Amino acid sequence: PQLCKFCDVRFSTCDNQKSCMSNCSITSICEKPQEVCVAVWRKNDENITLETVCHDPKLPYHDFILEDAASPKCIMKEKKKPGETFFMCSCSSDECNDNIIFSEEY
Amino acid sequence: PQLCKFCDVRFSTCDNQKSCMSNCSITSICEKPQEVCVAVWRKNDENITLETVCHDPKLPYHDFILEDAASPKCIMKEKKKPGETFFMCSCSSDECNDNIIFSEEY
Amino acid sequence: ENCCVRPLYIDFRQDLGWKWVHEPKGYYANFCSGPCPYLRSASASPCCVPQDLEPLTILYYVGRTPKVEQLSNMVVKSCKCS
Amino acid sequence: ENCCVRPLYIDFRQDLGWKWVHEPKGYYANFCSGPCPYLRSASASPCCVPQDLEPLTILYYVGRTPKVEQLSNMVVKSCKCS
């Protein structure tokens, strides 16, 4: 059964870093079998937040597709969103949204 | 399952005794469930024999009825037979025909 | 010495491979150990094994919903020879 | 000392209550006894129990017919800790 970090939206200090830990203490058993892990990082002119949840990849999230769901790691990809910097990733190995990676792995 | 001494006919020295041991080393599991134990003691002018077998009480044995089959002990009763002294008993507790009793118990 | 309960702490993630238990992180499961008598008083000689097993209360999440429940026979409370 | 097979003679009539075995009158069934290690190398500490169990050949009668057959796992041949 898929396990994912699920702290919903939290402030974060993740910034100017190649990768970041979610610092979410909630590892959850996703309530539906097809759900995968998701992480959303956003920075507006005031703060940075990191959202972690379970989510069905057949459904949009923040109106975007979770195109990378089969991936075992959460590789952040930028989405166009006015007034802020928005990055998102999905993945499907246990607690994979606990480590978010910006740009590709070395 | 009923167990009985089953040495068939053997010579015996049982004579002028209130009770006797069969001295039969064969304790048998009767092949049919309704069979009970039987002992037959006979003395002619030449010798004494003791016969031990399993036998269905609904069937005659030496042409006689096994009228005492429900009894737990083998109490010998005389049968009229010309030219010899003939005693028989039947009983239905394990190895009960190993101890044959003449006349009633004290 | 004799047969009795020996303390043993079990860590869910490290020892059971369970990453979904939110609290506690682990617990005293304990085990039975110790000599027993050669013979029996009501194969092989008697062994020191658990007698009373107690349950453990844990907290975990399904979706964003916390759930408090209990697993039975998680804690060895007493041992017996047999 | 350690864990191993201990000799034990069993009499069919006296100990098992079996009056129908014609031969043998009894046999060495044996049992396992002895200390084992605290820990395991692949609840409770390991115990000394039988490993290899062998069969016993007996002779008995059904009606006036002798029958030779064998009962499996009647003889403890070796012991193991576990």
Swiss-Prot record, chains A, B:
Stretches assigned to the Extracellular side = 1-106
Protein origin, superkingdom: Eukaryota
Q: Which cysteines are joined by disulfide bonds?
A: C4-C37, C7-C24, C14-C20, C30-C54, C74-C89, C91-C96
- Outcome of substituting C14R: In a gastric adenocarcinoma sample; somatic mutation
Briefly state the modifications made to the protein after translation: Phosphorylated on a Ser/Thr residue in the cytoplasmic domain.
The positions flagged as glycosylation sites are N23, N47
The places in or outside the cell where this protein is found are: Cell membrane; Membrane raft
The family line of this record is: Belongs to the protein kinase superfamily. TKL Ser/Thr protein kinase family. TGFB receptor subfamily.
Connected disease: Hereditary non-polyposis colorectal cancer 6: An autosomal dominant disease associated with marked increase in cancer susceptibility. It is characterized by a familial predisposition to early-onset colorectal carcinoma (CRC) and extra-colonic tumors of the gastrointestinal, urological and female reproductive tracts. HNPCC is reported to be the most common form of inherited colorectal cancer in the Western world. Clinically, HNPCC is often divided into two subgroups.
Give the protein's biological function.
Answer: Transmembrane serine/threonine kinase forming with the TGF-beta type I serine/threonine kinase receptor, TGFBR1, the non-promiscuous receptor for the TGF-beta cytokines TGFB1, TGFB2 and TGFB3. Transduces the TGFB1, TGFB2 and TGFB3 signal from the cell surface to the cytoplasm and thus regulates a plethora of physiological and pathological processes including cell cycle arrest in epithelial and hematopoietic cells, control of mesenchymal cell proliferation and differentiation, wound healing, extracellular matrix production, immunosuppression and carcinogenesis.
Q: What interactions and quaternary structure are annotated?
A: Homodimer. Heterohexamer; TGFB1, TGFB2 and TGFB3 homodimeric ligands assemble a functional receptor composed of two TGFBR1 and TGFBR2 heterodimers to form a ligand-receptor heterohexamer. The respective affinity of TGFRB1 and TGFRB2 for the ligands may modulate the kinetics of assembly of the receptor and may explain the different biological activities of TGFB1, TGFB2 and TGFB3. Component of a complex composed of TSC22D1 (via N-terminus), TGFBR1 and TGFBR2; the interaction between TSC22D1 and TGFBR1 is inhibited by SMAD7 and promoted by TGFB1. Interacts with DAXX. Interacts with DYNLT4.
Q: What is this protein called?
A: TGF-beta receptor type-2
Species: Homo sapiens (Human)
Q: What is the lineage of its organism?
A: Eukaryota, Metazoa, Chordata, Craniata, Vertebrata
Q: Which residues of the full protein are shown?
A: 48 to 153 of 567
Curated annotation (Swiss-Prot), chains C, D:
Disulfide bond annotation, renumbered to this chain: C3-C48, C32-C79, C36-C81
Q: Where in the cell is it found?
A: Secreted
UniProt-recorded name of the protein? Transforming growth factor beta-3
- Organism whose genome encodes this protein: Homo sapiens
The beginning of the lineage is:
Eukaryota, Metazoa, Chordata, Craniata, Vertebrata
Range within the parent protein: 313 to 412 of 412
